[PDB]
């Protein structure tokens, strides 16, 4: 009894890009994730912590909706101890993690004729990020001894850069709509199971 | 400008090791990304390894664990500290540039290049 809708998430209309990637802090209602267990409609689903199965038995405070969209072969790079491109530039994990993260492939919607430039990604930084960091800049990176900001050229570089989707892609650079849960314990009691 | 030293050639032995170094000008090793790449007899222009600008390192399949990568921050030069290697490891490798991605990195400089001698 007394449920709360999660389909604007899963079954969103559309995403944002991966250093933009939206929080939704979801508390004080029923969770059904044996539902999403069962679909059997990803192809990748690494649920952390917890075993996956018997996992509905416990619920925690807060959970936290997490959403972006990556190429389909930097999927091993969304883990705990784990390096590479946006594992280091544009989404870091924390060691402990025990969260949930679900994934499955989307070109068939959003891998249009040509290639989509509405995603962007990192490609550039000092060093690498935190665990549970975002970094909404729009700043032109400086790879030299000059100062960059207004000037383009030599080490004077565009941090973010788009995505070539074609429909004709291989199976390893498909656009991979990534969504992770992030579960939260504290002093406040637990909210959302059913 | 940006210039490249490859020197560290000489008469090597598997299952030993040498000391390789890389310099430049221009930018700085520590903070630009850095792509080691070789070229062999009988052999395409094979990447090698790869340093990454926030810190994290990778290497091949037959050159990881073996091979550590190195860099001086303020010397502002790269180093390959060759260690534990192997008779198949003849070749002729280069110090370069990855600029983006790809099936290697595009590499806008190439290096001198130093041959390596594994020969007792």
């Known amino acids: 009894t007394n449920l709360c809708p999660f389909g604007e998430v899963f079954n969103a209309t559309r995403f944002a890009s991966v250093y933009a990637w939206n929080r939704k802090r979801i508390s004080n209602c029923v969770a059904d994730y044996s539902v999403l267990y069962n679909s059997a409609s990803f192809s990748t689903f690494k649920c952390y912590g917890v075993s996956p199965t018997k996992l509905n038995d416990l619920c925690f405070t807060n959970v936290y909706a997490d959403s972006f969209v990556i190429r389909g072969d930097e999927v091993r790079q969304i883990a705990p101890g784990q390096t590479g491109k946006i594992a280091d530039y544009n989404y870091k994990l924390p060691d402990d993690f025990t969260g949930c993260v679900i994934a499955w492939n989307s070109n068939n919607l959003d891998s249009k004729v040509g290639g989509n430039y509405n995603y962007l990604y990192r490609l550039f930084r000092k060093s690498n990020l935190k665990p549970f960091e975002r970094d909404i800049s729009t700043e032109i990176y400086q790879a030299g001894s000059t100062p960059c900001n207004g000037v383009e050229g030599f080490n004077c570089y565009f941090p973010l850069q788009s995505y070539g989707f074609q429909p004709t892609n291989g199976v390893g650079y498909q656009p991979y709509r990534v969504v992770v849960l992030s579960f939260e314990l504290l002093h406040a009691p637990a909210t959302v199971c059913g | 400008e940006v210039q490249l030293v490859e020197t560290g050639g000489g008469l090597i032995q598997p299952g030993g090791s040498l000391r390789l170094s890389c310099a430049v000008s221009?930018?700085?090793?520590?903070?630009?990304?850095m792509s080691w790449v070789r070229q062999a007899p009988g052999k395409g222009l094979e990447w090698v390894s790869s340093?990454?600008?926030?810190?994290?390192?990778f290497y091949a399949d037959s050159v990881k664990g073996r091979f550590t990568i190195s860099r001086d921050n303020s010397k502002n030069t790269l180093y390959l500290q060759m260690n534990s290697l192997r008779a198949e490891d003849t070749a002729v490798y280069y110090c370069?540039?990855?600029?983006?991605?790809?099936?290697?990195?595009?590499?806008?400089?190439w290096g001198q290049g130093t041959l390596v001698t594994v020969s007792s």
């Open positions: 370069a540039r990855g600029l983006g991605f790809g099936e290697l990195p595009p590499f806008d400089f």
């Open positions: 221009g930018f700085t090793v520590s903070l630009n990304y």
């Open positions: 340093i990454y600008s926030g810190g994290s390192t």
